[PDB]
Structure formats: structure tokens, C-alpha cells
Amino acid sequence: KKIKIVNELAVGPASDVPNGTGKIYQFNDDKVIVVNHGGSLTAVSAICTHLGCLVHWDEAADMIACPCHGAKYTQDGKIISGPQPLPLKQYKVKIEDGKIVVSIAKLAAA
Amino acid sequence: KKIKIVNELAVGPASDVPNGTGKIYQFNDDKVIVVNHGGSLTAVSAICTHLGCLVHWDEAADMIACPCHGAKYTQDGKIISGPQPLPLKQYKVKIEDGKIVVSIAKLAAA
Numbered sequence: 280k281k282i283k284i285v286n287e288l289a290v291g292p293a294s295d296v297p298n299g300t301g302k303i304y305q306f307n308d309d310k311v312i313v314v315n316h317g318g319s320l321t322a323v324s325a326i327c328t329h330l331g332c333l334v335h336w337d338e339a340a341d342m343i344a345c346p347c348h349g350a351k352y353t354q355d356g357k358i359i360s361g362p363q364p365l366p367l368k369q370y371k372v373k374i375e376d377g378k379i380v381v382s383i384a385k386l387a388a389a
Numbered sequence: 390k391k392i393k394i395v396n397e398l399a400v401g402p403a404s405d406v407p408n409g410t411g412k413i414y415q416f417n418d419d420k421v422i423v424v425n426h427g428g429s430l431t432a433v434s435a436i437c438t439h440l441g442c443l444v445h446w447d448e449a450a451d452m453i454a455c456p457c458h459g460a461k462y463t464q465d466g467k468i469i470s471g472p473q474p475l476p477l478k479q480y481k482v483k484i485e486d487g488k489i490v491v492s493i494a495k496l497a498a499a
């Protein structure tokens with residue numbers, strides 16, 4: 280009673296993103312930042328929804344920071360502060376065979 | 390004894406790029422990073438020559454850094470280290486009427 284289409288990609292070894300760090304990967308047309316912090320491995324779009332620069336993980340401040348107009352986001356992409364209109368799109372992410380597997384789903388009813 | 394074609398664009402107010410900072414601008418088909426550091430206002434292509442992520446200025450480290458795979462460049466776009474094949478193409482930049490004017494030339498001899 281629902282159709283959904285999932286894109287799925289093993290982007291790199293789990294050892295790429297050890298604790299306290301974040302790394303940017305290509306996901307087809309988007310760029311995703313995968314973050315490993317506080318026991319939690321998350322994945323969100325790395326492109327600011329304001330005007331489209333790349334973000335990075337700031338471990339000391341426990342935040343994602345955008346270098347262009349000062350946007351600050353949570354590890355999960357939620358808005359902390361800045362001019363950005365939207366949160367960064369949330370991905371799913373898992374470790375499989377020692378690999379970081381990122382995925383996103385788009386739904387549709389039958 | 391030389392003819393050249395110059396693209397020129399007043400990209401924003403000079404107040405946009407104070408000392409110790411760098412800013413990204415659309416320059417027709419390229420994107421340029423203008424950096425103000427050490428009394429020197431420079432402008433180079435913002436597109437990393439490895440795989441094309443947008444770069445940013447790192448004032449603390451005195452370098453242009455690409456967030457994807459670690460490319461480092463000097464303020465003038467020269468390669469410091471990383472997987473990139475090429476330096477960032479250099480633009481010329483000056484202040485007029487409190488505005489940042491970026492320009493680049495393509496040659497023709499006669």
C-alpha cells in the first residue's frame with residue numbers, strides 16, 4: 280500500500296569517520312556530510328539551503344558550520360541560527376561490511 | 390603590441406571582505422574567492438581543481454582549503470598540498486567606489 284524508491288550507496292570505510300569527526304561525500308547529485316559524534320553516526324546534506332556552499336563539522340562547538348553566511352546547524356541538520364530558510368535534508372546511514380552506507384527514500388501510495 | 394579581452398564585474402562592496410576573511414562570488418561562469426589578508430586583496434577561482442568542490446578561506450592556517458579531500462592552496466591559488474592537479478586560476482581585483490572589481494584577461498597578440 281506504499282511504493283518508495285531508495286537510493287543507497289556505500290560511500291567509504293567506516294574507519295573514514297571516527298569519533299569527533301565529519302566527512303563530505305558525493306551522493307549522486309548532492310553532497311552529504313557524515314558525522315560521528317557522541318556515539319551517533321548521522322548523515323545530512325552538506326550544501327547550505329540558503330545559497331549553496333559546503334559545510335563542515337565543528338567538533339569543539341558540537342555543530343555543523345557553513346563558512347559563507349554563518350549558518351549553524353545541528354549534527355542532524357536542524358537550524359541553530361543564521362539566514363538559512365531550511366534544515367539540511369536528513370539521510371539514513373548505517374555500517375555494513377565495515378562500510379558507511381548512506382540512503383534516502385521517496386514515498387508514494389498505491 | 391598586445392590586445393586582450395577582459396571580463397570585469399563589480400562583485401560587491403569592499404566592506405564585504407574585511408581583513409582576515411574571504412568571500413565567494415559568482416563571476417559569470419566561474420566562482421571566485423576574494424581574500425583579504427596581510428594587506429593583500431587577492432582573487433582566484435573558488436572551484437577546487439581536483440573534483441570541483443567549493444573552497445573556503447582558512448584565516449587561522451593562512452590557506453585556501455577544500456573541504457572534500459584536503460586540497461590546500463595559498464592565498465594566490467598556488468598548490469600547497471593535496472590531490473589537486475592544478476593551481477586555482479588567478480584573477481585580478483581592485484577597489485573602486487568602495488566596490489570590489491574582479492577581472493580576468495584572455496590574450497591576442499598583434
Ligand code: FES
Nearest residue numbers: 327329330331348
Ligand atoms: S550559503 Fe550557507 S549561509 Fe548562505
Ligand code: FES
Nearest residue numbers: 437439440455458
Ligand atoms: S574536490 Fe578539492 S580536494 Fe577533491
